[PDB]
Write a protein that binds this ligand. Structure first.
Ligand code: NA
Length: 275
């Protein structure tokens, strides 16, 4: 058309670009290394949304803001929630029951947004994107769909590579530490454990000793100070940085999703193979 596509943040942006190729014009609302967790609304998001045909989002959190700006523009854009069809996990402790009409009804409360850290989930994202584009632009559907199938083949190879790396590790060396745990879907998919803070460093320290955790990793979401406290108290070496919610810049080590995951998985395995 070009199909005008807005993606809320860099990782989804990469997916969009892979699916859309030259048929789309892509704007990404939150770019690499921003001091934002995943996505956060900004008024200037309006300028991109107002021209849009399709808006790609992670989840339901700020779909209010996005759809209110879309209505105000008079645009009529399809909003695709890319976690549709992903088995999302609740945040630790999130649940609770409410006694509606006699029955104790469970209320989910706040899902962990970091679903891309499991590569089978990134396949669903990509499949949802091709569906949304295929939909808004019937003529492009064969191209989107061939782009999607080929990227999904590469994701499949990546998921096997990650599994082959982790499977080579000893069974008693599977635990690392982070100040902020953006990695619960990685832990659910692959054979590794992440400990993070849930005075209470003491609790964490005990589980660290109990699990013989090998290393600590930095990430962009926690502040810096907490990380230094924990390593100091635990006497664990700082092995590197894991990419959680954003790609790196184009000269960094995580300039697209595949490279991001290669990095994370490779750095984790390196630390566990030796620390
Ligand atoms: Na971030």
């Amino acid at each position: 058309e070009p199909l005008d596509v807005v993606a809320t943040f860099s990782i989804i942006g990469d997916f969009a670009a892979k699916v859309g190729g030259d048929r789309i014009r892509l704007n990404v609302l939150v770019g690499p290394d921003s001091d934002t967790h995943v996505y956060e609304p900004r008024p200037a998001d309006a300028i991109a949304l107002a021209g849009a045909d399709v808006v790609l989002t992670n989840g339901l959190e700020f779909e209010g803001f996005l759809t209110r700006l879309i209505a105000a523009s008079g645009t009529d854009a399809a909003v695709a929630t890319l976690t549709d069809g992903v088995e999302t996990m609740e945040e630790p402790g999130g649940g609770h029951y409410h006694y509606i009409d006699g029955k104790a009804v469970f209320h989910a409360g706040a899902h962990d947004p970091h679903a891309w850290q499991a590569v089978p989930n990134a396949k669903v994202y990509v499949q949802n994107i091709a569906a949304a584009f295929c939909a808004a632009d019937a003529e492009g559907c064969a191209a989107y769909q061939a782009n999607a199938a080929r990227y999904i083949g590469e994701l499949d190879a990546l998921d096997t590579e990650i599994r082959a790396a982790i499977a080579a590790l000893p069974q008693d060396r599977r635990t690392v530490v982070v100040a902020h745990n953006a990695f619960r879907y990685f832990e659910a998919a692959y054979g590794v454990h992440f400990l993070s803070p849930q005075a209470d460093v003491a609790g964490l320290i005990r589980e660290i000793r109990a699990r013989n955790a090998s290393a600590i990793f930095a990430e962009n979401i926690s502040d810096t100070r907490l990380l230094e406290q924990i390593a100091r108290e635990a006497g664990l070496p700082l092995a590197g940085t894991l990419y959680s919610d954003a790609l790196s810049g184009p000269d960094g080590p995580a300039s697209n999703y595949i490279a991001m995951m290669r990095h994370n998985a490779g750095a984790i395995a390196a630390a566990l193979a030796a620390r």
